[PDB]
Amino acid sequence: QKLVFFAENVGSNKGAIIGLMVGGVV
Amino acid sequence: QKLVFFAENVGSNKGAIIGLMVGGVV
Amino acid sequence: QKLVFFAENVGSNKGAIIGLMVGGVV
Amino acid sequence: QKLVFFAENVGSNKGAIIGLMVGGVV
Amino acid sequence: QKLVFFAENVGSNKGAIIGLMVGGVV
Amino acid sequence: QKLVFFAENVGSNKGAIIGLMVGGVV
Amino acid sequence: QKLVFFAENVGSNKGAIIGLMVGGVV
Amino acid sequence: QKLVFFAENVGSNKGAIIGLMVGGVV
């Protein structure tokens, strides 16, 4: 019932993308 | 280059989703 | 029910976008 | 290049959503 | 149903836009 | 260009929404 | 039942706009 | 580069999904 996410960059990387989705499909 | 996000649900989460992208298009 | 997000830059940007939404499909 | 936002709900809700996008030249 | 948003700029800015809505629609 | 806004509901509410954009026209 | 908003423009020529409304539609 | 994400299932593990990609296309 609880979710958490964090992103940290320490370098000049290229394109970066992140996505997350929670639910309960049956 | 530093971003963080967190969610919190007490009762019940129906459907939560999050997405992020850097650089985009131009 | 409760959601929070924060961004922090540490260098240089150009094109970035972020979006989040709570409550979706069960 | 510094922005922050937070939302707080007392009881319940239908569906909250937030989105942000930074630019540079246009 | 409380929401707050704040942004800060170093100096010049253009092409940056942000929007948020609470209790939207599913 | 610094701007900040906050809202507070006592309870009875339909749907609050806020949007802002920098760089363009007034 | 309380809402407040404030903005300031000075960075280079003007070109910023913001709007907020409480109580949309059920 | 340092990023971490965690989520909890309501008791099914078949409706929740998450994906992330760094240093994608230039």
Candidate from A4, A9, A17 with C-beta closest to B7: A4
Please tell me the total count of domains within chain C: 1
Rounded to whole angstroms, the Cα distance separating H11 from H26 reads 39
Q: What are phi and psi of D3, to 5 degrees?
A: -145, 145
Q: Could you tell me the residue range of the domain that residue B3 belongs to? A: 1-26
Rounded to whole angstroms, the Cα distance separating E23 from G22 reads 11
Q: How many CB pairs under 8 A join A and C?
A: 8
Candidate from F14, F19, F22 with C-beta closest to E13: F22
Q: Which two tokens stand for residue D25?
A: 């030249």
Contact F11 D14 (CB under 8 A): no
> Chains that contact H by 3+ CB pairs under 8 Å?
A
Candidate from D1, D4, D16 with C-beta closest to C22: D16
Q: Which two tokens stand for residue E16?
A: 């940056």
Return the SS3 of A17: strand
Structural biology method used: NMR
Q: How far is CA D18 from CA B2, C5, E11, H11, in A?
A: 19, 10, 25, 28
Q: How far is CA A15 from CA A21, C16, D26, in A?
A: 21, 10, 21
